Amino acid sequence: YGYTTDDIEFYWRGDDNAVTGVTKIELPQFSIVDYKLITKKVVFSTGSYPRLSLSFKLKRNIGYFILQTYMPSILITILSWVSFWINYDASAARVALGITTVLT
Amino acid sequence: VQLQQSGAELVKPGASVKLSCTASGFNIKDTYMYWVKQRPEQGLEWIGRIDPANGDTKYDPKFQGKATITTDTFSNTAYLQLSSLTSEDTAVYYCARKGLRWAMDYWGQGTSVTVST
Amino acid sequence: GDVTVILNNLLEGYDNKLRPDIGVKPTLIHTDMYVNSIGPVNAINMEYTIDIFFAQTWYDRRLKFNSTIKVLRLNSNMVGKIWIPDTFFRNSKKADAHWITTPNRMLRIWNDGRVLYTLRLTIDAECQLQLHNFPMDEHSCPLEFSSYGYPREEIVYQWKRSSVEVGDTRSWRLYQFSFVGLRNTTEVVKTTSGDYVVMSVYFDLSRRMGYFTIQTYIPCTLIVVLSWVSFWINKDAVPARTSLGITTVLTMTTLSTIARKSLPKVSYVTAMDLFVSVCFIFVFSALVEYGTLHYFVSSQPARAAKMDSYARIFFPTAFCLFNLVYWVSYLYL
Amino acid sequence: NIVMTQSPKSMSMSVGERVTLSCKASEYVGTYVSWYQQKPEQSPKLLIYGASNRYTGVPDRFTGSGSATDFTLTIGSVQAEDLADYHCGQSYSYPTFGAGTKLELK
Amino acid sequence: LKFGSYAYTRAEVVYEWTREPARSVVVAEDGSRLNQYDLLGQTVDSGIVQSSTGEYVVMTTHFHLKRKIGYFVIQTYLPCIMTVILSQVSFWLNRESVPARTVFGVTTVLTMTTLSISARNSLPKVAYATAMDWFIAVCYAFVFSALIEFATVNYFTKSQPARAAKIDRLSRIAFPLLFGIFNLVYWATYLNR
Amino acid sequence: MTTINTHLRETLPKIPYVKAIDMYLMGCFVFVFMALLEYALVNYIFFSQPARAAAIDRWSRIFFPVVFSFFNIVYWLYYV
Ligand SMILES: *[C@@H]1O[C@H](CO)[C@@H](O[C@@H]2O[C@H](CO)[C@@H](O[C@@H]3O[C@H](CO[C@H]4O[C@H](CO[C@H]5O[C@H](CO)[C@@H](O)[C@H](O)[C@@H]5O[C@H]5O[C@H](CO)[C@@H](O)[C@H](O)[C@@H]5O)[C@@H](O)[C@H](O[C@H]5O[C@H](CO)[C@@H](O)[C@H](O)[C@@H]5O)[C@@H]4O)[C@@H](O)[C@H](O[C@H]4O[C@H](CO)[C@@H](O)[C@H](O)[C@@H]4O[C@H]4O[C@H](CO)[C@@H](O)[C@H](O)[C@@H]4O[C@H]4O[C@H](CO)[C@@H](O)[C@H](O)[C@@H]4O)[C@@H]3O)[C@H](O)[C@H]2NC(C)=O)[C@H](O)[C@H]1NC(C)=O
Ligand SMILES: *[C@H]1O[C@H](CO)[C@@H](O[C@@H]2O[C@H](CO)[C@@H](O[C@@H]3O[C@H](CO)[C@@H](O)[C@H](O)[C@@H]3O)[C@H](O)[C@H]2NC(C)=O)[C@H](O)[C@H]1NC(C)=O
Ligand SMILES: *[C@@H]1O[C@H](CO)[C@@H](O[C@@H]2O[C@H](CO)[C@@H](O)[C@H](O)[C@H]2NC(C)=O)[C@H](O)[C@H]1NC(C)=O
Numbered sequence: 001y002g003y004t005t006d007d008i009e010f011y012w013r014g015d016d017n018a019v020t021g022v023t024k025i026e027l028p029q030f031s032i033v034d035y036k037l038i039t040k041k042v043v044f045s046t047g048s049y050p051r052l053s054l055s056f057k058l059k060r061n062i063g064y065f066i067l068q069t070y071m072p073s074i075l076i077t078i079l080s081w082v083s084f085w086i087n088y089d090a091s092a093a094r095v096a097l098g099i100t101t102v103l104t
Numbered sequence: 105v106q107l108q109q110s111g112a113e114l115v116k117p118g119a120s121v122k123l124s125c126t127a128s129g130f131n132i133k134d135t136y137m138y139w140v141k142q143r144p145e146q147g148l149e150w151i152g153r154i155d156p157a158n159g160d161t162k163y164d165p166k167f168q169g170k171a172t173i174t175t176d177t178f179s180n181t182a183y184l185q186l187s188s189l190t191s192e193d194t195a196v197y198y199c200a201r202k203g204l205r206w207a208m209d210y211w212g213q214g215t216s217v218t219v220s221t
Numbered sequence: 222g223d224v225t226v227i228l229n230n231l232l233e234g235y236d237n238k239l240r241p242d243i244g245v246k247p248t249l250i251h252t253d254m255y256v257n258s259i260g261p262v263n264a265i266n267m268e269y270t271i272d273i274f275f276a277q278t279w280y281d282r283r284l285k286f287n288s289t290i291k292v293l294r295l296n297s298n299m300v301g302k303i304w305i306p307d308t309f310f311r312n313s314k315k316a317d318a319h320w321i322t323t324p325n326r327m328l329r330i331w332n333d334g335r336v337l338y339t340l341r342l343t344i345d346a347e348c349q350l351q352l353h354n355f356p357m358d359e360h361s362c363p364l365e366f367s368s369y370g371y372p373r374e375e376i377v378y379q380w381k382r383s384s385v386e387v388g389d390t391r392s393w394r395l396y397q398f399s400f401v402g403l404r405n406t407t408e409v410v411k412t413t414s415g416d417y418v419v420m421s422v423y424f425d426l427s428r429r430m431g432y433f434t435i436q437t438y439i440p441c442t443l444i445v446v447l448s449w450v451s452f453w454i455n456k457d458a459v460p461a462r463t464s465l466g467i468t469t470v471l472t473m474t475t476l477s478t479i480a481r482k483s484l485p486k487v488s489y490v491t492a493m494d495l496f497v498s499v500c501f502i503f504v505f506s507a508l509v510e511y512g513t514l515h516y517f518v519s520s521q522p523a524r525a526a527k528m529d530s531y532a533r534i535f536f537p538t539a540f541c542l543f544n545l546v547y548w549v550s551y552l553y554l
Numbered sequence: 555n556i557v558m559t560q561s562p563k564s565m566s567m568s569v570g571e572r573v574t575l576s577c578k579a580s581e582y583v584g585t586y587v588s589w590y591q592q593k594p595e596q597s598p599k600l601l602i603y604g605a606s607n608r609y610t611g612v613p614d615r616f617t618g619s620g621s622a623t624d625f626t627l628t629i630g631s632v633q634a635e636d637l638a639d640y641h642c643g644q645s646y647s648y649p650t651f652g653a654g655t656k657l658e659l660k
Numbered sequence: 661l662k663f664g665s666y667a668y669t670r671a672e673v674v675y676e677w678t679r680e681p682a683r684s685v686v687v688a689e690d691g692s693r694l695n696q697y698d699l700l701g702q703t704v705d706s707g708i709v710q711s712s713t714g715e716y717v718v719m720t721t722h723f724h725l726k727r728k729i730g731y732f733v734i735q736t737y738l739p740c741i742m743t744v745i746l747s748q749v750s751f752w753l754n755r756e757s758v759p760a761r762t763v764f765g766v767t768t769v770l771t772m773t774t775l776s777i778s779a780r781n782s783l784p785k786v787a788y789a790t791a792m793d794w795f796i797a798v799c800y801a802f803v804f805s806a807l808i809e810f811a812t813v814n815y816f817t818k819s820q821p822a823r824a825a826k827i828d829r830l831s832r833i834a835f836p837l838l839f840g841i842f843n844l845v846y847w848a849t850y851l852n853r
Numbered sequence: 854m855t856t857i858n859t860h861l862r863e864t865l866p867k868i869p870y871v872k873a874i875d876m877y878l879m880g881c882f883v884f885v886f887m888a889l890l891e892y893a894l895v896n897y898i899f900f901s902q903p904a905r906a907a908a909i910d911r912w913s914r915i916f917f918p919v920v921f922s923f924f925n926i927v928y929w930l931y932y933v
Contacts, residue, residue, distance in 0.1 A: 020413065026349050028267065028485045063488035067498065068481060072474055075505060079470070082509070085516045093459045093515075100467045104474075138649070148590075148598070148641055148651040162648060165555070198597055204674070205604030205706065206645035206681065207588035211597040255712060276712070296667055327667035327713070339713065341666070386712065396785050431787030435797075436780065440773060443800065447769055453811040454762060455818075461762035468766045472773050479777055584705035586681055604706070646704075647682040695866040730869020734879075735862070739855065742886070749889075753896055760896075771855055778859045782867070 004047035012037045012052065019054055030058040076104050105129020107199050109212040117191045117219045125199030125212055127180045133157040137182040138200040138208055139173060141193070151197075154182065194218050224293065227286045231330075237304045240375065241281040247377045250279040250306055252366075252420060254385045258393045259400065259424060260345075265485050268314055268347045270394070271364060276339040277306060285334035297326035297340075305338060306376060311365045311419065315345040352484055355491040356397075356433040357551045361425040372415030380405050385422055397433070398426040437480045437493065441500045444472050445540060448504050451511065452533045459515065466508035473501045492551045499543060507536065556581045560642050560652035566660035570631055575655050577625040577642035586645035587625045589618055593638040601640075602627060634659070661721040669714035677704065677719070685721050697725040736779040736792055740799040743771045744839060747806040751832045755824060758814050765807035772800050791850050798846075802839055854882050873932045880924055888917070 012018035080101040152163035203209030260270025319325040325341040348362025585605035605620020643651040677684035703722040816824035
């Protein structure tokens with residue numbers, strides 16, 4: 001914060017192994033794909049300051065979202081399709097089935 | 105440590121009596137002081153208590169207005185005054201102090217008042 | 222008095238920045254715990270709360286006095302004036318001591334220099350719960366601690382013979398779980414700063430299915446048995462059976478949604494999402510079976526006559542066999 | 555006004571046998587029941603302060619047992635100086651004592 | 661509310677109430693932020709706990725609370741009774757209108773399920789059965805019994821009309837009697853407890 | 854009516870007494886409940902005579918909005 005780039009200097013101790021324990025992280029919804037260590041300098045109206053950046057690329061799993069969200073919608077779409085096998089006589093059945101698929 | 109009471113009293117029914125209880129070995133502003141009565145061959149009866157550090161006094165409902173308990177801090181004495189005593193409160197009057205688990209650990213020596221003619 | 226003289230003489234020329242035997246040998250610290258309660262084990266954040274009386278004891282040759290009294294029993298006033306180890310809990314997400322009404326710490330110094338330091342802590346520790354077999358699962362998830370700055374060559378920890386003591390175990394906040402036992406462990410862990418002696422306490426918990434039963438297993442089974450009654454309804458009332466099917470699928474979806482919210486948003490299938498998924502498949506299967514029945518009654522009645530009579534005996538046996546294999550396979554683990 | 559009922563009202567007993575006195579409260583008195591001993595023509599002496607705590611100077615044969623409403627005082631090897639009255643008194647509220655129990659020798 | 665001394669054993673620091681124990685913990689008159697309970701009184705005690713470091717004086721205070729039923733009545737007990745009545749009113753419709761009574765029964769079951777879900781989310785996640793759980797279970801049993809009984813009545817139509825008529829006339833009056841006796845026994849055993 | 858009652862009651866604390874909003878919701882609930890009971894009564898005597906059924910229907914169509922408006926006016930005049 002206070003010290004500019006001509007007063008202090010940042011770097012990673014090891015430069016590839018400075019951040020450990022990232023491959024052991026167990027996220028319940030994501031999964032760490034990659035991580036990067038970056039060294040640069042930023043410029044604000046008060047001077048130039050060193051900056052390090054530790055970035056993690058997370059990827060969201062699909063195992064939960066399929067069964068919890070995509071399967072109901074597909075089954076409601078099939079349960080909306082099923083009215084075509086119903087004859088044109090039974091109007092009440094197809095109307096109730098279609099409108100309640102819309103309601104679901 | 106020790107509580108010393110006064111001698112026995114022989115009074116006439118309709119007068120007032122004043123009993124004293126002098127404490128030796130402690131300051132009475134640290135505990136409560138209790139007055140208990142005991143009739144011949146019966147159980148104890150609590151008259152009232154006084155908080156000497158404050159002056160707050162509480163009495164038994166069957167003794168409110170009859171008895172009055174005061175304290176003298178300068179000489180470490182607790183006083184019990186009975187206003188108009190009839191021909192049935194001829195008992196022994198004990199002076200006690202509160203103890204560890206709110207018990208009466210130290211008692212006096214008893215003052216046996218007697219009312220007759 | 223004389224205790225003032227002892228306390229003032231112990232702190233003369235004393236440096237609380239240096240551990241005892243700073244260049245001689247590591248300090249041996251004996252640790253004890255007393256678990257007041259193990260709080261709610263919520264699986265959402267993968268954590269659990271615990272309340273303990275953490276006690277440490279070690280030897281400090283600078284706090285050695287000669288007197289006729291054997292032990293000085295003090296407040297937390299002198300805790301910040303002598304050397305105190307920097308014990309910290311490695312698996313805690315949040316941890317705080319207690320400060321009401323006065324800092325809940327205790328210091329006791331003995332005649333030979335043995336210091337005992339106890340303090341009350343409420344820790345919100347984390348333990349990753351492998352939520353397979355849920356809710357018929359068993360866990361053993363830890364509370365670990367070690368020194369922060371002093372490696373193995375400077376501070377060594379060691380349990381006593383009466384290390385961890387639980388209280389009554391009935392006044393604890395374990396709703397869905399049940400305490401069954403514990404075990405202590407010591408190890409050495411590699412860290413960027415050095416080797417640290419780490420001590421772990423594993424509490425073994427088993428989930429009591431008394432809440433998930435009347436929460437999810439009873440209503441889902443009730444919705445399945447409800448879906449069963451559609452077969453006993455006359456096959457001519459078409460809106461009746463359609464209404465039965467759509468209301469049962471709706472209610473099963475609602476029950477699955479309200480049932481998923483207990484455990485976190487994990488990506489694998491559990492033993493509870495398997496149950497509600499099989500029930501949802503059962504309801505959908507009943508509905509599509511009625512659909513094919515209504516389609517086939519117009520084409521050929523000879524094939525559609527015995528469909529309902531087959532379903533009335535095929536659905537309960539399939540559900541009972543599924544329940545049998547499911548309950549044995551998930552209660553054997 | 556919490557009333558303490560003590561039982562029995564009068565008893566006799568020989569030397570060297572266990573004896574038990576009981577005190578029952580109408581209302582709740584937590585552990586603030588005390589047992590006093592009074593020999594004839596003397597002031598009462600505190601035996602048991604609180605429920606199950608012996609006073610300083612009391613032999614190890616007196617012991618009390620407490621509850622919310624039911625209280626007992628048990629003596630073990632009884633000698634010949636326990637021929638006296640024993641009162642139970644509560645201190646949860648303004649103090650009230652029991653009726654008393656007269657131990658005798660026979 | 662147990663409090664005592666940390667770091668000071670019984671031979672060093674003892675606690676005691678400053679006034680009479682019945683008059684030491686004093687609750688104010690307007691001092692009640694309770695919405696769901698009702699403070700009945702206080703209760704103090706004093707004792708000794710034996711810890712790993714010595715004996716400590718512990719002063720205990722119990723506040724006695726009684727839960728107010730006015731919320732749970734309107735939340736659960738009035739919807740359960742009204743939903744049971746809505747299930748039982750189906751027995752008065754004729755046996756020739758089968759989709760009507762079918763959707764009656766199944767939507768009554770739907771109401772019971774959403775009721776049980778909304779009523780279970782108030783109480784914490786205990787691992788046993790409370791009185792409200794037993795009430796919801798018996799009401800669900802009554803509603804489900806009504807629907808299965810209707811299914812039986814409908815199944816017995818077009819083959820044995822007299823048997824269906826007999827069992828619908830018997831179950832038109834047997835259900836309120838059993839529900840009323842259950843209500844009487846439940847409220848009697850859980851109000852006098 | 855049950856859904857509207859359950860989604861809105863959960864907002865405020867679990868107070869025992871009956872609020873004004875609770876009074877209105879129970880009024881609306883008893884009204885829709887009695888509407889269903891009147892339909893049930895119409896269906897009960899539907900096979901026997903259509904005259905009484907039609908009479909109850911045209912009586913309901915005239916006497917339900919007036920009683921509802923009476924309750925509504927009593928509510929908005931007593932609670933203001
Ligand atoms: C960013 O800024 C943040 C805010 O500024 C900052 O957070 C602050 O952290 C500092 C340091 O960690 C805290 O300061 C310490 O707090 C300790 C207690 O912390 C708990 O309580 C505080 C509130 O503290 C009050 O109560 C305690 C205990 O009663 C007192 O000790 C405090 O002095 C203070 O007392 C007053 O206020 C009370 C009401 O609150 C009144 O009732 C009372 O009358 C007083 O007026 C909470 O705020 C804390 O919560 C937060 O922090 C916790 C940390 O665990 C978090 O987990 C949580 O989430 C919250 O964020 C927490 O609950 C104090 O014990 C401590 O006092 C001693 O240590 C300091 C430092 O060494 C000494 O200078 C000081 O002299 C004290 O030492 C004496 O007493 C100790 C007792 O252990 C002895 O060991 C020692 O030898 C010494 O003895 C001598 O003096 C005694 C009298 O003082 C005497 O009796 C003895 O005889 C002897 O002579 C210290 O104050 C501060 O509270 C935090 N502030 C807040 C609001 O969070 C953060 O660190 C900064 N971050 C960074 C990265 O920079
Ligand atoms: C996620 O996004 C951040 C920010 O957009 C990414 O950080 C970036 O990383 C790249 C690759 O290291 C940097 O590019 C490099 O720039 C240096 C400049 O000397 C050049 O020599 C290298 O050959 C390369 O071009 C980029 O500057 C940097 N951006 C910033 C502003 O930090 C990050 O990589 C992304 N993904 C991951 C996995 O972190
Ligand atoms: C806590 O740790 C102690 C010390 O390691 C355990 O005590 C040991 O118990 C084993 C038997 O299982 C004995 O063979 C050792 O001699 C004991 N060591 C000593 C000196 O105590 C204790 O069982 C552990 N408690 C647990 C695991 O909860």
